[PDB]
Amino acid sequence: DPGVEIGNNDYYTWCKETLSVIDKDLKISGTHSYYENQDRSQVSFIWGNIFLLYTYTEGISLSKSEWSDALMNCFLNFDNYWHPNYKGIAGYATLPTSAEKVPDRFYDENGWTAIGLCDAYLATQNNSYLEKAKGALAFSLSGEDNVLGGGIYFQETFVSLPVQKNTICSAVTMLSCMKLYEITQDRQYLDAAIRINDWTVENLLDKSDNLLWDAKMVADGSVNTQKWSYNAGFMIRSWLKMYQATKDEKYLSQAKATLASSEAKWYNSINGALNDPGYFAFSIIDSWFDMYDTDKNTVWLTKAFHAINFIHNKLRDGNGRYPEHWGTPTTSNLEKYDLRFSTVAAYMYMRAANYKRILND
């Protein structure tokens, strides 16, 4: 029973507490923008804001009236990161930008954002959210070409990084495509997800453990074989959507094989720890929630609540802050922190609150 794991845990309150501390530490006074880190000297990179977007969006499921304004204010902050036309195409930048400036854009960042904006549209029916979801996803899809036979580049403007195509770009683009396919019923999104998936499985999936390698270098086809939880997790979420859309059992079997291997590699089911950066490992928890949505087996929720309980009860420090990595209990207060460390925890708490509500309905 997940009931045993949920107990009297007030996930909804834990989320609000976490958001309060984030705002205190990192909200830029007089704005709805956030600093990157404890130095409070640079506006945040887009990524930590994406976890806020996800949190407020999920909040709508708990209370539309409580979270609608927060979601809209977040969306309007994202407008600061939107570039309406750089070298012929619109898309989000990693830092605030405007039409007359040169942006630094990433195909993965745009897909992470597209996912959130699709969910925001599903929650609210606000067309402006979907317009940007489509624009962000179009930007991600513009990173796809037949160099290496397919796949999507890490970034628009390579400088110090070698030119490469990356699993996370495949995976967030696939999931975005599947969400927009559900909304629009336009088969071109489904076909894109299938094409990108076929390339990704052929080039970046390790058949020995069903985990995902990180990237493939354009210069020589060499693979970065580092295995990160989020490369598996976003592929699992995508495959589960593809299963729902196609009813082809191959997607479910692949999702289950990759998820089992992800649990074996990263999850200590005894204490609930996830042995990776939180801003990656949360994707395994979202995979468990998707599995519950798929088969209604409550054991998936027991795992999710156990891991989220660990975050609160073992990772949270004496100042209500969160560490980068989820693998080990926190034993002293953090001196350094970036926006994404606590925002991902807030998101997890809101997801947990939602599933607690669903179980008690």
Author numbering: 36 to 396
Direct quotes from the study:
By comparison, early studies have shown GH76 enzymes to be far more specific, with activity only detectable against the extended α-1,6-mannoside backbone present in yeast α-mannans. In this paper, we present the crystal structure, determined by SAD phasing of a selenomethionine derivative, of one such GH76 enzyme from Bt, BT2949. Furthermore, we show that despite poor homology at the primary amino-acid level, the tertiary structure of BT2949 appears to be well conserved in other GH76 family members. These enzymes form a long trough-like structure, which is consistent with a requirement to accommodate extended polysaccharides such as α-mannan.
Initial merging of the data with AIMLESS in space group P212121 appeared satisfactory (systematic absence probability of ≥0.98 for three 21 screw axes); however, the structure could not be solved after several attempts at SAD phasing, with poor contrast and mapCC (correlation coefficient) between the two possible hands for the structure. Subsequent reprocessing of the data in P22121 allowed facile phasing of the selenium substructure and model building of two complete BT2949 molecules. The crystals of BT2949 belonged to the orthorhombic space group P22121 (unit-cell parameters a = 81, b = 121, c = 126 Å, α = β = γ = 90°) with two protein molecules present in each asymmetric unit (molecules A and B appear identical, with an average r.m.s.d of 0.07 Å across matching Cα positions). The final atomic model for each monomer spans a continuous peptide chain comprising residues Pro37–Asn395 (residues 1–22 form a signal peptide and were removed in this construct to allow soluble gene expression).
